[model samples]
Target: ASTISVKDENGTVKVPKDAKRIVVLEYSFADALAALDVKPVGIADDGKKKRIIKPVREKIGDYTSVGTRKQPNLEEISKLKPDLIIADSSRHKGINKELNKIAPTLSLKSFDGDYKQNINSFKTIAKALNKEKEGEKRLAEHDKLINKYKDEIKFDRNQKVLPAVVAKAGLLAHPNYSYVGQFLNELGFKNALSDDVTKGLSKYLKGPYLQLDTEHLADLNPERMIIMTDHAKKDSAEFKKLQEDATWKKLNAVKNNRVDIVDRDVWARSRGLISSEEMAKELVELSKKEQ
Candidate 1:
């Protein structure tokens, strides 16, 4: 398990031998570390309560919780003496500065479906650790997986899988939107979200919908629902009451059982190849079971 030095046109990553002490401050990052077979000294968030780890949480839940993504355990991080800390650009703006001092932090900026972004994620993380060649090899494999799944999974227009709606809200929780839709589109799934949020448009930004009412959910009547919740926080009154509401009981997916809860760290965060592969498998499985 020696670290490899890697470099590419986008950037460079030199993984230190002492880089073993790692801290993860985003769901995507946690998933990425897991994919790399690395453990975090601390996590930005813990989905343990809801069992959001899904298939993998059991092995990694022992890591210390460092508050939420927005708030991390700075003291614990220092004590851990992490050689690297990874954070997502969209979520960890405030904590970025101190992390740089604690460890050579590499904050990954969000990228769209372009091969460039994909390359950047693979290469940059690799380069930061000097494992660029390893990164290249792994990313090349990931691209193949993406293509293989795309070619194998064929959806019929008659199947009515396209124009599908992705919506979830345990009452005033964040309304699912373009993020998931965009990811689905990347995987060759039909998605109807937008130009603005996806592109981070200035004009059309009513801010992204973090919370929406049940009426909006009812209006969607999506053929399927993908739920990503803080499962550990389920006992909270807010989340529990939302599920008990009559409005939720009446949803098509809930009644029909088309709802699938993915691991928040993996599919929900939408980071790294392993999570993407898992997502494709679940999506293909769902289609097989239903259609």
Candidate 2:
């Protein structure tokens, strides 16, 4: 059997040239495979099929649930008898050895990766699947589409923007290095929570997302805000309370009506060419609306 040499987060790995039965441990990995028109046998979708997003689900079709991304069911994964196992670097490092015992595991960065890294990971995944040509074509199309969106959207680079995951707990702000932040920056918008700004606040607050309250958000004062909500209702109880709050109402984005609520699954969870393009297209559509 022919094999392909691909470098993932775990350095060089020898994978089956045409791995048929693949099991993905991350949502982004599933997205990457879907972009290449390859359906994964099983996916660690946190036991929730809806979290995979409609477009992705439609492309990949039905798949066995391998439990959660953090703690995937090894027994279920082994039962699938996948030729290749795609795992997350940060989330599955401890289980790397165990995963390899089941099959050739290609661990890559996902949870803690930015947009650039995510794109690169897609390329690597394609290489592992021996679908380099298809991946390249898809990537080119992705770039063209994103560039087109950037041109179509009339964004003022000078104005800062904030993209946050608003849940029942609180708002988790995406920093300049997060997947969504980099995507926004690629579309010619500056991230409101810059590295310098985050560093000045607190040392404990590090990583892609920052835990912030209304006061912290007020201080950031982003000109535009993209609220990615987990719930279906545009106005969840927590988010509605936030909108009704005096502090929230005073926000520049709120006052100017420069706020757009989007799906959290795509924006906050999934990171791949498909999701990025979807986001870019949505932004372009939003830009056309009267503010």
Candidate 3:
């Protein structure tokens, strides 16, 4: 088979000219493949089929599970006999050599990546799959959808919006550079966590998501808040506790009733072209309702 060179996070790698069988270690990679109408043979889905998200799962019909994203089962991955392997740069760095032994591994950023990085990784994945033309067309469509949503969702530039994940563990805020944060920022709302704030908190946390206590959250006090959580109901214990807290009640979002609950799967995970489009669509709908 002919070979084509594709540059990923680690550097350039020579992959098959047209890889028929591919294994993706992250959900976002699977999303990239699905966007290009290609199905991955194997995915590290943490053994949960629903984690792939509905649209992506529908596009790629059936795939074998290669274990979790953090620790993909090498034996299972090798057994699939993939011609190309897509792995997360930060999560799978320790096993890149082993993955290469099974097949040409394309290490890209996903978990630690923001919206821009994910978009770049999508292009790389398309190139590795030898679908550059199709990739560009799909990306153009993605941008068009995003722009439509941006026009629909009217927001004051000065007013801040915060996107956060609330779980039993705690509340984690997405900074301006995180995937969802950048997505919201692109739609015209300023992220509540500014560069100065994130820079100050850099000593406590290293990633895009910053863990914040109620006091810290009150200090930010965004005009709007988009909350993603695992709880099924609005009155879940975690939310109830937060609602009862004096600091949480004083938040501008709470006072103005601008706190919106969104799906954790699409907002918090599955950072790819399709997921972003879905988010844009949802945000437009939310904006319409608010108006």
Q: Which numbered prediction scores highest in lDDT against the true structure?
A: 2
Candidate 3, residues 147-183: lDDT per residue as tens digits? 9888987555677888887654346888898888888
Per model, how many backbone clashes are there? 21, 0, 0
Pairwise TM-score winner, candidates 1 and 3: 3
Q: Could you tell me the C-alpha RMSD of candidate 3 in Å?
A: 1.8
lDDT tens digits, residues 1-291, model 1?
455454422244455666776787655555555555566777766434332354345445567777666567788778777788776665666777787788767666542222235436555665665555676777788778877776666553222121222233433222224444545666665432234322432332344433345665565445555655443233445556656878878977678776655544444454556667776776667667754
Deviation in Å, model 2, residue 122 alpha carbon = 0.7
Clashing pairs in 3: none
Order of models, best lDDT first: 2, 3, 1
Reference-based lDDT, each prediction? 0.55, 0.86, 0.85
Misplaced by over 4 Å in model 1 are 1-18, 47-62, 110-119, 157-178, 194-206, 210-266
Error of 2 at 134 (Å): 1.5
lDDT of 3 at 119: 93
User: Estimated TM-score per prediction?
Assistant: 0.65, 0.94, 0.94
Residue 91 CA displacement from its true place in model 1, Å: 2.9
Superior candidate under lDDT, 1 versus 3: 3
